[PDB]
Amino acid sequence: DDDIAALVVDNGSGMCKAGFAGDDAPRAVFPSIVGRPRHQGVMVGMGQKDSYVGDEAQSKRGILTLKYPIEHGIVTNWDDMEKIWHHTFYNELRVAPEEHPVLLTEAPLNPKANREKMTQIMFETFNTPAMYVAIQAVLSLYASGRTTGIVMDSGDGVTHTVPIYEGYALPHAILRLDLAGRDLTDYLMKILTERGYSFTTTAEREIVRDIKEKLCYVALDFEQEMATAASSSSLEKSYELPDGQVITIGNERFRCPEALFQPSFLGMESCGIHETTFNSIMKCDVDIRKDLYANTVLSGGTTMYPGIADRMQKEITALAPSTMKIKIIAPPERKYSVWIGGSILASLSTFQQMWISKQEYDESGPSIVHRKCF
Amino acid sequence: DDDIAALVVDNGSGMCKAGFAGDDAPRAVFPSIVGRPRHQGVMVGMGQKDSYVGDEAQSKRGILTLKYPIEHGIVTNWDDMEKIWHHTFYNELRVAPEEHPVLLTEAPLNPKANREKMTQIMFETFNTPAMYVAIQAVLSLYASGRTTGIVMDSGDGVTHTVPIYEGYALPHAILRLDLAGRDLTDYLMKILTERGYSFTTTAEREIVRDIKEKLCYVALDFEQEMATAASSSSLEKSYELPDGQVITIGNERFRCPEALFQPSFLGMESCGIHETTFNSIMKCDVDIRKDLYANTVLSGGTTMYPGIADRMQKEITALAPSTMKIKIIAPPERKYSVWIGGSILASLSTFQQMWISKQEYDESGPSIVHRKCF
Amino acid sequence: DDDIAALVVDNGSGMCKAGFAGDDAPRAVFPSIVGRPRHQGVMVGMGQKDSYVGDEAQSKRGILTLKYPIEHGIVTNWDDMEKIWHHTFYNELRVAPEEHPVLLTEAPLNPKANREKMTQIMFETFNTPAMYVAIQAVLSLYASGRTTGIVMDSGDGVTHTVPIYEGYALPHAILRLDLAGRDLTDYLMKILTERGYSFTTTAEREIVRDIKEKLCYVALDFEQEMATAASSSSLEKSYELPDGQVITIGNERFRCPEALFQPSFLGMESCGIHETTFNSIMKCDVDIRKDLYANTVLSGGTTMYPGIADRMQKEITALAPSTMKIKIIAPPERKYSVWIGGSILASLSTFQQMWISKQEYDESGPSIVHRKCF
Amino acid sequence: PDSNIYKKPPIYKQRSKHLIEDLIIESSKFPAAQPPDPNQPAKIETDYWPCPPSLAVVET
Amino acid sequence: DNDNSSARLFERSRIKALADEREVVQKKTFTKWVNSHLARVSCRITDLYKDLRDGRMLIKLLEVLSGEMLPKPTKGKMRIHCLENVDKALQFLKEQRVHLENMGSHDIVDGNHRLVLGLIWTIILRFQ
Ligand SMILES: Nc1ncnc2c1ncn2[C@@H]1O[C@H](COP(=O)(O)OP(=O)(O)O)[C@@H](O)[C@H]1O
Ligand SMILES: Nc1ncnc2c1ncn2[C@@H]1O[C@H](COP(=O)(O)OP(=O)(O)O)[C@@H](O)[C@H]1O
Numbered sequence A, B, C: 001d002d003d004i005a006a007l008v009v010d011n012g013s014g015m016c017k018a019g020f021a022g023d024d025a026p027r028a029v030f031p032s033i034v035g036r037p038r039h040q041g042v043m044v045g046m047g048q049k050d051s052y053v054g055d056e057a058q059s060k061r062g063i064l065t066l067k068y069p070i071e072h073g074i075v076t077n078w079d080d081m082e083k084i085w086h087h088t089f090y091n092e093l094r095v096a097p098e099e100h101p102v103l104l105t106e107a108p109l110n111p112k113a114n115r116e117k118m119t120q121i122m123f124e125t126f127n128t129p130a131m132y133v134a135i136q137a138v139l140s141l142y143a144s145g146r147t148t149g150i151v152m153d154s155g156d157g158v159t160h161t162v163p164i165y166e167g168y169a170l171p172h173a174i175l176r177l178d179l180a181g182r183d184l185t186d187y188l189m190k191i192l193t194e195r196g197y198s199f200t201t202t203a204e205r206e207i208v209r210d211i212k213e214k215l216c217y218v219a220l221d222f223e224q225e226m227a228t229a230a231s232s233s234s235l236e237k238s239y240e241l242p243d244g245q246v247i248t249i250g251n252e253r254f255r256c257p258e259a260l261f262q263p264s265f266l267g268m269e270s271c272g273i274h275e276t277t278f279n280s281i282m283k284c285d286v287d288i289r290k291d292l293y294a295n296t297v298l299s300g301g302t303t304m305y306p307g308i309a310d311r312m313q314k315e316i317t318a319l320a321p322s323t324m325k326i327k328i329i330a331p332p333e334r335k336y337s338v339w340i341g342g343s344i345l346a347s348l349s350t351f352q353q354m355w356i357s358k359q360e361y362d363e364s365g366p367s368i369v370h371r372k373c374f
Numbered sequence D: 001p002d003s004n005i006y007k008k009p010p011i012y013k014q015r016s017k018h019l020i021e022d023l024i025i026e027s028s029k030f031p032a033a034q035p036p037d038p039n040q041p042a043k044i045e046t047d048y049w050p051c052p053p054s055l056a057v058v059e060t
Numbered sequence E: 001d002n003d004n005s006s007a008r009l010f011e012r013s014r015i016k017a018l019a020d021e022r023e024v025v026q027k028k029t030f031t032k033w034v035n036s037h038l039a040r041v042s043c044r045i046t047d048l049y050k051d052l053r054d055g056r057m058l059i060k061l062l063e064v065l066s067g068e069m070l071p072k073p074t075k076g077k078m079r080i081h082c083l084e085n086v087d088k089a090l091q092f093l094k095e096q097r098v099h100l101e102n103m104g105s106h107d108i109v110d111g112n113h114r115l116v117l118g119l120i121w122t123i124i125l126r127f128q
């Protein structure tokens, strides 16, 4: 069916994006949050809504307990995930899920039951004719337009590095780090108590996330930046709360993202993202290491702090041998790249035979995804 | 007949060479390897390539396992040999095999089934009008241009000495030694371990072979060179790995080829190449030995080490009586000499009588090759 | 005997064993791990410790980062080795090192700088009167009580096969494989992610090692065992973590040691241990292969999985010719077996002539060991 | 060993209502909720596609 | 090093020169042969190595030679769509039981001279 176009649903811990195949941009982007009321209702006849999904929960942060169904790339609560998928299909896109194939994404290293539950829910509740599950790291390489390179993807829930040479992927060199954007948000909310600002509930967690998105950067030299910040007040900015209160972020702007490079601030003994990328490169074979050095690819929202590319290049160049050439590739639209290449994956002619059919699922149970999908 | 030129194909264990008759140099020279992928294939739409053969098998050696169809001059796997021959005929030379006859080379002492299967393959599948099989060390004497002499041919698979006097070859004095650059590469890979460098995969064996071809030489005196290497560091040289790492070979440079003269480093009980040549000389009659002393011919790629000729001349002079004059003839083009001899043999007007016609093969089966040829 | 009994020290990658000569069992066995504090120091008044060595570092894994001085049989860090040797000599055995000769063990193929540095440390710092260095496989053959056989010793860092015929070893037939218990532990960590259990820090490495030691076995037939495990719930075991949580391992129990026989599970292209042993046998002479077939000796902790002997016998018998029988002699004492052999080597009267005297070390230097040992 | 992937139909192709509601159902399948413009190139042909093209196109 | 330099001189001069002359002559002749059949439709190639990368002209040439309808090329300008377009022609050649060895889509896309020339030669041997 040439008329039928598959839906690409980029599914992450922080945001959910959805669109049609062959399109350069997703149609609907919205936060993946679920809120329920926490205060007494005294006005009769106002309504009977008891669950808020998406921007409707984000607007009414005052009277809701916001919570995330997906934590560290794993769907902890499945009822809220069904809620999010229903709101995606019917209210955001206005399409019938029974007429289209659905393409879904997930982290590389997952519990194996997650794929089976996702496939069973997509086949039984929505009656999709076909579906497929892909890995978010490969789709960024599709979006970058190159067949070889190493993909470092860090989103709201999980960080992972995957190297691919000439279209061939090495599984033993895949590295997963649980450091992500929510840990940075929690670190910012912890270090903001030094100046006297206390943020404790979920709405203030959203406020802290907005502060981190708007006012943060990565220092090229940490100690020199700390000395400069202690010397004068040139590295200071002001932010206005919804209460109208004005806070001064000051020194903390380059301290929150630095926990990505030094995880010992958060109590974790794991290596930094630059060291993880270097280890993933060095785990590969000798002949292909130069091409992986030349084609490092950055992806995910968390990698849009200003100056992260220069710091990453400097650290890798310090780690790597001096005679090799190091390049860091950071597209300006990288936040959506995991979606974009996925749409490309749905636009290929040979991919039409890679869908998991409804008949195949009926024949083989939910465990068909392990032998059909990478 | 005049414009039609028979193809000349030199087929050793290491590399395959091919060209037209009457040419001074072969048109196509490429290694004889067949590689296959081993890792995951995850990018959809890149196309499927089952096997890699030839020079472009070397370029993508990072994601391939490499196999040699010919071991010790014997075709162990015949399907890969058909792959190599097809790639030679079509991609490298762009000639139809029906148009021209084919001239092949082989080792002196080989199993009969190798010759029978070579004849059967070159008649039944490629459909050639004529074909001839010759000895490499005989063609080396054609390239040298002299009627009499002893040829010591050392390639990647096997070393052999044949004497020829006045165009007559003595079959009982032909000597074969299974000591070539293949075992020297293995020995270099073994002795590089004690300096801290470890090469185990089949892809790293090509790197070890390149190191051998770039930084090896034959010492004229072994003990004095060992004392010099122990005393000073002037013998040390540096090599750069493909990933930018730098290694220092140092003492090993004159120890890897020294296994040619003393096989006891490899555990072999056999004699050295100089003793093999001397024994092949003394297995002949008394009268011709003087002439066999004056026309020793070196050939093959293994004899390209610097200083091999001086050491060989010194050892033969030490073994031979003092009243005889010993000289070693080593042209600069001794790697390709066999092929040149083949062309000189293929363009003779007399040799047009000696081709094996297709009708004779159809009458006599694959057993016709032993009655003709040699 | 009027001679001070020499100390026998087995220095492997995983554990260190130490005892006196002529004793049937080692006195001190403890892990070779050097831990360091990583958290913030409060509660002034209690004594501080610079580092934790050995068993004590296993008692307080929560507040330490845990590191190995030996990686792949090579001493990467030498200060930690000096600390471990000091703790062995003064805390565990509580003897004066200057009164006793010292016997040490190492891997067959390793850099010579390791031997030179161990000799330099044991003469210059600990000031021992004499020492000797031996290969672990030879000591295993000593402990087996037979003179002729082939030894496959696999510790926590390296695997090696050495054939010895009537007191004569073949250097060309010695094979080394870098596949040991630590790679199996890493593979177990990677495959435990499928069930949802995450172990990342160095403290959880010991927990995963305990899980591997307690609940793993080698299946006789891999495919039949996989079918049986997928068929029903007959094969699951429950393990209790030190935090109180209970995990179920199930399918993984026979999948972790299977990587010993199929290294392609780890991404390596090397052969299995059965193919390595068979190739080591085939590299020997024709006459001694029959004796080597019937005298196969297993040693090392990594060969302590249940069912390893029957599986190894089946795999070797498949490759071997049908006319002979294959014996797999696995002593119940194999984990300590190397040390036992060392004690026997320290009890012979003729071994007293082979000690490297202190005067000899002053005479020649640290380079004497290559002339003296092996 | 000898077959063509593209000539075969897609796998997902294998398996009363009001006519106007059927029309609105199958009008919503298009990405623009309407039939595409006939003489208009698709999104991949257009140069405002954010992803970089192949190297030969860059040389051209 | 002197004889090593002489050997490098020999295999730098003669082996390169003969092969380059032969491949230049083959390139011109193959260009004329392809242009003769491709002139029935309004298509023409100037360089054999460069115009055959995108895979469209290979499909047009195979459509002209064979006489039936190949599947239409993938609508794209990326490297992946380029690989797909070359793979379609290679699979169509796999229909006709023409034997191709060491031929992949990426080899044509990258522009290896010898393999492209061998592909054209194999097509000529089949469809003449
Ligand atoms: N412009 C920005 N600058 C800095 N950080 C950002 C920006 N936009 C988003 N982030 C961070 O990235 C996270 C969102 O990541 P996202 O790409 O949604 O992950 P996923 O899509 O995998 O769920 C947010 O938690 C936020 O902290
Ligand atoms: N320049 C060189 N110097 C030293 N050894 C060489 C050199 N070139 C090749 N060799 C050795 O010769 C081998 C190739 O020999 P080759 O001539 O291909 O044998 P054959 O053609 O009979 O198979 C290589 O494996 C290498 O060991």
Ligand SMILES: Nc1ncnc2c1ncn2[C@@H]1O[C@H](COP(=O)(O)OP(=O)(O)O)[C@@H](O)[C@H]1O
Pocket (backbone or CB within 6 Å): C011, C012, C013, C014, C015, C016, C154, C155, C156, C157, C181, C182, C209, C212, C213, C214, C300, C301, C302, C304, C305, C335
């Ligand atoms: N009972 C057991 N069952 C399974 N594996 C074991 C057992 N005991 C030890 N091991 C494995 O063997 C390793 C210890 O080997 P060891 O003999 O100490 O090596 P070395 O002494 O050469 O360092 C441990 O890492 C462990 O994984």
